[PDB]
Design a protein around this ligand. Structure first.
Ligand code: CA
Ligand code: CA
Ligand code: CA
Ligand code: CA
Ligand code: MN
Ligand code: MN
Ligand code: MN
Ligand code: MN
Lengths: 166, 510, 388, 388, 510
């Protein structure tokens, strides 16, 4: 019940073993990403095992997708049957239309949560990482120090628990 | 009909054109900067000539190691403290070299000029050589040294302790994760230029003073290569100095790069040098000041002033929180000695005198504490005492900076004592300075590294060590030790009997 | 001074005495084998494995990793320093790969350096022996300088296709192999230029400028489809494994092997050219060296993975189909170079035989490893279609 | 014992301190250049010269010697360990010679070792690349196995012709060069056998036995006169300089260069054989390397000796005439091999051109250095008579 | 299409066939023995493989020298006495190596079997390597040592002194002058198998004890080569063991070979080791008694009695000379110090004890004389004294053995003080034993080596030294010295003032 081998992981392994269809497995993966990944995760309960669990879940989705999809689709369609290039161009469009760095980070992060392979094909995904990332940094690193910590904390919307400074 | 040939210089005269423009001839990586495709590299090399100059260096190096040094028993006649220190220095630098490989591969992808790509390529192969060289130091000390454990499995035993996490930040993730230009600065413009290099030399010095002729033999060889990456360091600031974005982004990634690097090495290096050695070379306080001022923050950076480059705005802060940083850290490292993969020793009489002489006030704080721990039997397995207990008993919480991963204890520190705690979407976050705090507040998704207290929360010490193989061959004696003598070594049992169960210190604010 | 001012702990009496006094009677652990915990590929663990396996700090969530937890600093957006998301392929352990030649940095530069120094000696003997005299002028000034010269950009492009892999590879053993595969390709491209620069010195009027061969590559017809495939493999593939696999197990195994071995290697001698074959000897040695590593990674390790064998074969099978087409086109366009040859140099029968050799070798060494159903006749027929 | 029992003066505190205490403040002479008294051939003295010149303990009565007195022990009868009596040539200093490549033992074995290791890599790639397929069977089983194979005994014989020189050479610089010249020849002979042994492994039914090629050498017609010259140069010459000069500046410069370069090197490619040319590349590199040394000793040093220039030229001129005839005969008999080739392989015109090349090179590189009046037409004409 | 190559043994299998038959296919050298053309060699090598195994050794060797050893200042941290000793050891062995080149070339010519020729060929190349290696030790100590003179020009300054002459006899002329089988025995069957190989090792030992890590690095490498020559040593006794002539010439040549080597090396190696070192390793007497008995004259030569090989009939006499010969000799070497290219030192107090403890009676003989010489001022330049003067004053003439060239003082010796003086055809010849005397009596024409006294007769000491370049770069100070300290070094004028004039000791006889 340690670091690399514990009840939680065993549990998800068995859980994952009962995913006989692509739609089910794919949907569970996306749901898992919404629930346990990124600073916007719905919960931090699986903080110590989610990274490993997610990978094991991706494994199932990839295997199922390969058996279900025909060659062209495996290369150009997402696990949800969506046209990969569309999603990519669409998301990039929204990113460029981003008003500020706050809307931008929401676009990029969500993109990762919903399309991270084996959902979207790696080629499109990393092509996306390339464009979304460039825009996000540009907006974020502009006058990076102007906003003082006192206000930035509020903009982030964090709950200040304790402060010390001699 | 005379005997003629062709050399690298002559063939490299045409390498610049090797690249041809087309549809998607562009970088696959996100970056705010645009690298001019007209950039040239300082050294006119081709694979063949690169291989040759490197092979000649290998000959000398391995020749010395396998022959004369082995005959002189150089792997053994080293001070115990240093034998241990090299397990950390060599393996930690090994990962810095290894990630430098991937990072320069990324820079290679970013460069559009064939020559700038070629410059990085040479570095990709150099960093691979350095990975293998650092690996060889551990390999050699394990084969011929006084204590193989740690040297023989650092790649897996390094994962038990907290010091390792910050290493992946400055020399791993900080090297490959983020804007290629940001990673470029973390590696070359700041990492290599400000620390890595002057550091490599220093290591050879501290090593020689402690009987280690193995490290100088290898590291001096690594330096020769690095003298080339330096010249290639400006090449990255030149291919963007024109792009308008650079005049609006460079200084920020550089400031964050500087802080990130010094946040870790300022404390760790001084610590490894002053506390991992017997014989001293130079007080870290004076070394750091020279490196981070008359050298980097002064001479080296000042020349880049004509490209816009401005001195880090966090330079004043860094020097402030530095004087006692390494001393402050050792108290923590020692207190959590069972989580290491190397043996630690407490300052002896001459050393305390040396420390006081060089850092007035040192004794009344650190000196007294170490004598207290020693008298209470922290080195004896039958005392049932490990300094971690002293921190708990005296209410001195130990946190891990969510950003730099550096351990800090505000209520005991003689250096920086500022602490900031926040709660965001169900998770608590602890910070040790205004710069790391900013980085997190703005880039929350870039910093989600779990700390040892989080992963080990609720776990009993001896169990974490056992699970992660923190033991020597006998399957009972700990790799880590609170002293460097050959007798009275601590065993797993000795630890289990302590009944230490980890707690996530942040929750005391609930 | 003569003794220096720096006192060393190994030789200074006073310091050495202190050190010796603090030493233990015997080593504190008899296990003096670094990397003892690594699973050997062969009888006993090798220096190559000890110095390489696990250098990459992967956490258990990346197949085979030994660490734990997330990366300390990630990309803006959240992208991990290294992650499963950078490749379609899946495995039980990314550290299973082993370069059959067991090449870590030292052995690699040692072998290439020997080659470099020999090459120098060769060229000096060649020129002094005046062997250049018996070489056909047309072949020298047209096929070697223009068409062979243009090929350098093909190898250069393949080299560049490795850039992303150097950054994304999920393990040390793979990253190191990848690096050496690409480095060998840039070497070859540079060797092609070395020959042109050599000819320029012993043949008055020979222009070493790359302008001509480059022009041929960028706007010619012979390598048009080749360049189009190269451009794609390099800049249109973001999956480090698809790039490496498609480059070495498809495009270069077919097009490259044909151009290098079945055209220039095969015909140069017929024109009294033993200079070019000297360099192709290298490219071929390099190709065969990389092939062993390529096979071990994609077939022995991924293609035969205990849990993802079927899955991975599907993907590579997919990739093979994806790139087999542009490669055929590259070969087709290349057929045009035969027409530029002097009458009688070679006939359609030899061409066909050489084609069958490349394809048959390809089928035996790669295609059959993933059960890709290849039709030798149909492939040869297609490339032969656009024959000069 | 982890530490050990043997106490070393450099690391033992007690001993080292005693040593350090007895040391002088500074060196007792600032001239730290061993061999400073040697006259440099180039700008600054070389490691090659320092380590070699004057190693031979010659007394002043042997031109250039620095010692004095007779040898301590001589041969029964009185023959000196080394003496002027072992060669007709005379000089003002036997230590004047310099190998242009400056080869002392270390550099020599280093270069050859690189060649050896590369050769291994080459053969492994060659066989794996299956290049053997495109090689003509007749050329392989008849000309390579029998005629090229037989040539090994020619090179072996030339190697053995150096034995006496290894014993009689009157200086270190010459002895070392002589040794390397002969060692390179035995190397080539062994490389010829290496190729036959290689073919035997990748070509079923290929016999690596030397029986056939040896039989061809001992009782054939093609190499009859060649063997006769070899046998003489080796066993009928007791003058170490006549042997070295006649072997490298006459026989091997004519017969050897023709066979190696103008026959096998020139025709192998025409039969899809790039294997043999790989080894000939070495022999030719070696030949050109030895040529530089041969020229320096016999022309620069002896042929242009300030006091014996005229005398020495007369002798070498004499030697050239003495061995030119047997060499022409060797070439003549060799002409018979062309009749064996498949029709159309080459014609009498090419043969004549290749002959003129060897002779013209020989006249410019050797014959003209001692003013030997050579008639290219007459020499070529005599040889062609051998064309069956 | 599976990767395949061809190794050396696969090629060597056909090497025996390389040689073919013809009328004049025979040796050009005179020899009483016939070498069977069916002989095989122990190692199946080809030029390529030989080169490779040798290159790998060079890598380590030079790597150690140029790198780690240079960094450790190994060329300097050696005892002064040893720095001097190595000038003689390395250069004298250099000529032994050099002559072995020509000698094996002669053996190569003698052998008729291609394999036996190949075995010798490897040796010819090894002895060149060895020449260059010994040359490198001197080269290195001259470049980085405490006293370059002697190291930098031994090849010409060695000609001034008498010790050098005997060296050319055992390791030069004895190696190449005479029946190839006689030379074979002088070099391999005795020179190496009895002295060189055990000697090379011993030198590395004495070197290590005196701070010299340079010599071990090179000589240990030379030893690895000589291992093959040893195995190739029996090959010469096997290719003749059948021929009837061998059964009646072998023992005679073997006896002389043995006496030749022993006569010189017995007293000289021991002299250089005991008097040329500060830290002793083992008394020459028991080092010798081991080599010649528990290693050669029994557990080595007895394994060849099946070929008609017996025991050196002069073995008994030789034994009675390894106890005192080297002591008899240092007396003479020091007495004639102005004739060397090295600096010598009087035995100190600690050394005299060692000598007396390991060789009872050493003090009452040598000790008392050395004490007297110092009283005379032999170390101080202004004394106007050179030990040679003492031999004149006390009527103790010094002779040179016309055969072995070994200097001897029959009136003071403790070894074989059996002087024999003969006149023949207008010339006087002096011998020191019954063995060398028979040699000269039977083979007059083989031994006409003129001695230093015959050559220097009537010459003033200072003039010989100046003429033969026996000076330091200041053109005034002597290379040789009677002490190893850093000041009070004798100059040419200090010697001239002595007005020493050589005279041929044998001329007193009527
Ligand atoms: Ca005939
Ligand atoms: Ca014609
Ligand atoms: Ca004419
Ligand atoms: Ca008389
Ligand atoms: Mn590096
Ligand atoms: Mn670097
Ligand atoms: Mn030797
Ligand atoms: Mn030997």
């Amino acid at each position: 019940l340690g670091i690399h081998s514990n009840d939680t992981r065993d549990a998800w392994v068995n859980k994952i073993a009962q995913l006989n269809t692509l739609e089910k497995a794919a949907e569970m993966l996306k749901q898992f990403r919404m629930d346990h990944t990124t600073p916007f995760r719905n919960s931090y309960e699986l903080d110590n095992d989610y990274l490993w669990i997610e990978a094991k879940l991706e494994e199932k989705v990839a295997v199922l997708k390969a058996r279900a999809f025909n060659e062209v689709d495996f290369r150009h369609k997402t696990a949800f049957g969506e046209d990969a290039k569309s999603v990519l161009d669409g998301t990039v469009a929204k990113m460029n239309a981003a008003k500020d760095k706050w809307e931008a980070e929401k676009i990029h992060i969500g993109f990762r949560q919903a399309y991270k392979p084996p959902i979207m094909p790696v080629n499109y995904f990393l092509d996306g990482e390339r464009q979304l990332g460039t825009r996000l940094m540009e907006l974020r690193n502009l006058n990076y120090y102007d906003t003082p910590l006192e206000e930035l904390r509020k903009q982030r919307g964090v709950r200040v628990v304790h402060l010390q400074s001699p | 009909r005379a005997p003629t040939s062709v050399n690298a210089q002559e063939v490299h005269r045409w390498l610049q054109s090797f690249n041809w423009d087309f549809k998607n001839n562009r970088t696959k990586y996100a970056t705010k900067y645009k690298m001019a495709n007209e950039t040239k590299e300082q050294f006119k090399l081709i694979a063949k000539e690169y291989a040759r100059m490197e092979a000649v260096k290998d000959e000398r190096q391995f020749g010395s190691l396998q022959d004369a040094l082995t005959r002189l028993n150089a792997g053994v006649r080293v001070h115990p403290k240093w034998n241990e220190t090299m397990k950390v220095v060599s393996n930690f630098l090994e990962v810095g070299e290894y990630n430098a490989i991937a990072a320069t591969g990324m820079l290679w992808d970013s460069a559009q000029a064939a020559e700038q790509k070629n410059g990085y390529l040479a570095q990709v192969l150099d960093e691979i050589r350095h990975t293998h060289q650092c690996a060889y130091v551990n390999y050699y000390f394990a084969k011929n040294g006084q204590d193989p454990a740690g040297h023989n499995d650092a790649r897996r035993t390094r994962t038990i302790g907290p010091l390792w996490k910050g290493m992946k930040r400055v020399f791993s993730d900080g090297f490959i994760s983020g804007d290629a230009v940001e990673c470029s600065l973390n590696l070359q413009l700041v990492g290599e230029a400000c620390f890595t290099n002057p550091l490599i030399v220093a290591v050879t010095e501290w090593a020689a003073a402690n009987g280690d002729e193995i490290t100088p033999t290898v590291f001096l060889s690594i330096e020769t290569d690095e003298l080339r990456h330096m010249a290639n360091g400006y090449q990255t600031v030149v291919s963007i100095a024109n792009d308008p974005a650079s005049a609006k982004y460079l200084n920020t990634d550089l400031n964050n790069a500087f802080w990130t690097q010094q946040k870790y090495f300022t404390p760790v290096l001084g610590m490894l040098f002053e506390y991992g050695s017997k014989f001293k070379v130079e007080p870290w306080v004076k070394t750091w000041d020279r490196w981070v001022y008359e050298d980097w923050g002064g001479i080296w950076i000042g020349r880049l002033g004509k490209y816009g480059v401005e001195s880090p705005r966090s330079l004043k802060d860094a020097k402030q929180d530095a004087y006692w940083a390494h001393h402050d850290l050792y108290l923590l490292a020692y207190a959590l000695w069972p989580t290491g993969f190397f043996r630690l020793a407490l300052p002896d009489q001459e050393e305390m005198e040396w420390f006081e002489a060089n850092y007035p006030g040192w004794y009344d704080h650190y000196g007294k504490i170490y004598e207290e721990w020693r008298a209470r039997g922290c080195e004896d397995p039958s005392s049932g005492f490990i300094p971690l207990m002293w921190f708990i008993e005296n209410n001195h919480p130990i946190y891990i900076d969510r950003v730099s991963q550096v351990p800090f204890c505000p209520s005991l520190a003689k250096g920086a004592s500022t602490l900031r705690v926040h709660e965001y979407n169900g998770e608590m976050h602890t910070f040790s300075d205004q710069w790391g705090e900013r980085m997190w507040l703005a880039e929350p998704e870039r910093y989600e590294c779990q700390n040892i207290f989080e992963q080990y929360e609720g776990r009993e010490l001896s169990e974490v060590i056992a699970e992660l193989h923190g033991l020597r061959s006998d399957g009972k004696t700990l790799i880590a030790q609170p002293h460097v003598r050959g007798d009275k070594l601590w065993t797993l049992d000795d630890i289990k009997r302590l009944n230490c169960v980890f707690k996530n210190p942040v929750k005391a604010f609930n | 001074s003569m003794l220096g001012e720096r006192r060393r702990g190994l030789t200074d009496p006073e310091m050495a005495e202190v050190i010796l006094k603090a030493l233990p009677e015997a080593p504190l652990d008899g296990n003096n084998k670094m990397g003892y915990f690594v699973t050997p590929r062969w009888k006993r663990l090798t220096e190559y494995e000890a110095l390489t396996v696990y250098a990459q700090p992967n956490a258990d969530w990346i197949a085979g990793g030994l660490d734990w937890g997330d990366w300390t600093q990630k990309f803006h957006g959240g992208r991990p320093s290294w992650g499963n998301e950078t490749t379609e392929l899946r495995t039980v352990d990314w550290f299973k790969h082993r370069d059959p030649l067991r090449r870590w940095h030292a052995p690699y530069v040692k072998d290439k350096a020997e080659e470099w120094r020999y090459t120098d000696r060769f060229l000096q003997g060649y020129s002094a022996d005046g062997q250049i005299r018996a070489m056909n002028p047309t072949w020298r000034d047209e096929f070697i300088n223009r068409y062979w010269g243009a090929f350098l950009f093909n190898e250069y492009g393949l080299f560049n296709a490795h850039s992303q892999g150097a950054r994304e590879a999920l393990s040390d053993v793979t990253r190191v192999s990848l690096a050496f595969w690409g480095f060998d390709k840039i070497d070859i491209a540079q060797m092609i230029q070395l020959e042109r620069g050599f000819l320029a010195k012993i043949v008055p009027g020979f222009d070493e400028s790359t302008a001509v061969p480059k022009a041929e590559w960028t706007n010619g017809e012979v390598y048009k489809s080749a360049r189009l495939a190269v451009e794609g493999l390099w800049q249109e593939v973001f999956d480090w494994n698809e790039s490496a696999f498609s480059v070495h197990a498809v495009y270069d195994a077919l097009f490259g092997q044909f151009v290098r071995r079945e055209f220039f290697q095969r015909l140069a001698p017929r024109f009294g050219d033993n200079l070019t074959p000297f360099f192709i000897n290298q490219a071929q040695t390099y190709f065969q060296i990389a092939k062993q590593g390529v096979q071990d990674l994609y077939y022995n390790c991924l293609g035969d993975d205990p849990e993802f064998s079927d899955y991975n074969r599907t993907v590579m099978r997919n990739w093979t189909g994806k790139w087999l087409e542009p490669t055929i086109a590259a070969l087709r366009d290349f057929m045009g170079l035969f027409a530029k040859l002097p009458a009688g140099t070679t006939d359609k029968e030899e061409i066909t035989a050489s084609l069958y050799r490349v394809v048959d070798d390809w089928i035996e060494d790669y295609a059959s490893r993933i059960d890709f159903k290849a039709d030798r006749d149909q492939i040869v027929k297609a490339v032969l279609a656009g024959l000069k």
